[PDB]
Amino acid sequence: TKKVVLGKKGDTVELTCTASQKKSIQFHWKNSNQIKILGNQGSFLTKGPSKLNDRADSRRSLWDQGNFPLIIKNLKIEDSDTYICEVEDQKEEVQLLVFGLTANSDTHLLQGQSLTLTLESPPGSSPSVQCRSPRGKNIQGGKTLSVSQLELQDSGTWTCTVLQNQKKVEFKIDIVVLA
Amino acid sequence: TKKVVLGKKGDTVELTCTASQKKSIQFHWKNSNQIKILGNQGSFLTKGPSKLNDRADSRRSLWDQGNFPLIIKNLKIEDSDTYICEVEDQKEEVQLLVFGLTANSDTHLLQGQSLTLTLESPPGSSPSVQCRSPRGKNIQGGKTLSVSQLELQDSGTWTCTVLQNQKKVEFKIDIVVLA
């Protein structure tokens, strides 16, 4: 059933899948594109064929609790698919939405200078961005945000919030303004 | 409901607890001795008072999936209690059984020398041990196992299996025999 996960570019993410049938059993994880990344073969975790192969995981450790995660390390925006956990006779449907958030300028600005933060995302993503400032000021945005010209006081870690469904991803860039 | 976890002395363990009610909510974890170790205060994880305080955890990261683990790092036999996950109106009852497995001799033995492996455990533990040898030989035991005298060939990583309920813990000690 339709559970969503929003992740962050570079950061690591984990999708939940629970059995609750006799405790240590066999599962599968596949991308909507029907190809699998993982399952436990015997007592072996096989990573069939996939872009993620060198990057996907699970914890052997919890399989006895009927917990069969999918750990996708070092995220790419692109990894933004529908993934499916498979346990004997049931499917878990969880989608990941990979975000990025640039400073197509830098962090080491100057008084008067403008600033442009840009939102990297998978398509199908209908995010609403809200960056707040070092001394609490909004900045509404689409896929591109812009600070006309900043001045001394808003030196500090800004806070962005890629607000999508309930689930939201907050980002923190530190900004340096000088003169 | 009565779920069990067998852990290993020193090693790290994780107890599973899942909600499945509106996705990001408030939980608690307490030892049968009724005192809590953790819960999420607001969006803060408070570690009340406990032996484990400096050692207990959870992943903030999955609370949005209704997953409220209990990560107890660096295990002590003693940490062998009944722990309870608490979510609004329900309890998860999971017990951890902390094991240890010594070589009250060493690893660097000699031909003819005897060997004694000893099982560290919480009381209430009704384990059945089975150590196999480097060239597959049993050794049944209670809380103490003994190799009369070993000879050259059983140099290698032995495999013990603290077999309790379904759930079992396997251990591997490497043995060196010389002459």
UniProtKB/Swiss-Prot annotation, chains A, B:
Residue ranges constituting the Ig-like V-type domain according to the UniProt record: 2-101
Tissue: Highly expressed in T-helper cells. The presence of CD4 is a hallmark of T-helper cells which are specialized in the activation and growth of cytotoxic T-cells, regulation of B cells, or activation of phagocytes. CD4 is also present in other immune cells such as macrophages, dendritic cells or NK cells.
Superkingdom classification of source: Eukaryota
Effect of S61R: Increases the affinity for MHCII
UniProt-annotated location(s): Cell membrane
Post-translational modification: Palmitoylation and association with LCK contribute to the enrichment of CD4 in lipid rafts.
Disulfide partners: C17-C85, C131-C160
Sequence ranges assigned to domain Ig-like C2-type in this UniProt record: 102-179
UniProt comment concerning the protein's domains: The Ig-like V-type domain mediates the interaction with MHCII.
Subunit structure and binding partners: Forms disulfide-linked homodimers at the cell surface. Interacts with LCK. Interacts with PTK2/FAK1. Binds to P4HB/PDI. Interacts with IL16; this interaction induces a CD4-dependent signaling in lymphocytes. Interacts (via Ig-like V-type domain) with MHCII alpha chain (via alpha-2 domain) and beta chain (via beta-2 domain); this interaction increases the affinity of TCR for peptide-MHCII. CD4 oligomerization via Ig-like C2-type 2 and 3 domains appears to be required for stable binding to MHCII and adhesion between T cells and APCs. Interacts with Aedes aegypti long form salivary protein D7L2. (Microbial infection) Interacts with HIV-1 Envelope polyprotein gp160 and protein Vpu.
UniProt disease annotation: Immunodeficiency 79: An autosomal recessive disorder characterized by childhood onset of recurrent and recalcitrant skin warts due to uncontrolled viral infection with human papillomavirus (HPV). Some patients may also have recurrent respiratory infections. Laboratory studies show a complete absence of CD4+ T cells.
Described purpose of this protein according to its UniProt entry: Integral membrane glycoprotein that plays an essential role in the immune response and serves multiple functions in responses against both external and internal offenses. In T-cells, functions primarily as a coreceptor for MHC class II molecule:peptide complex. The antigens presented by class II peptides are derived from extracellular proteins while class I peptides are derived from cytosolic proteins. Interacts simultaneously with the T-cell receptor (TCR) and the MHC class II presented by antigen presenting cells (APCs).
Protein name according to UniProt: T-cell surface glycoprotein CD4
Lineage: Eukaryota, Metazoa, Chordata, Craniata, Vertebrata
Residues of the full protein shown: 25 to 203 of 458
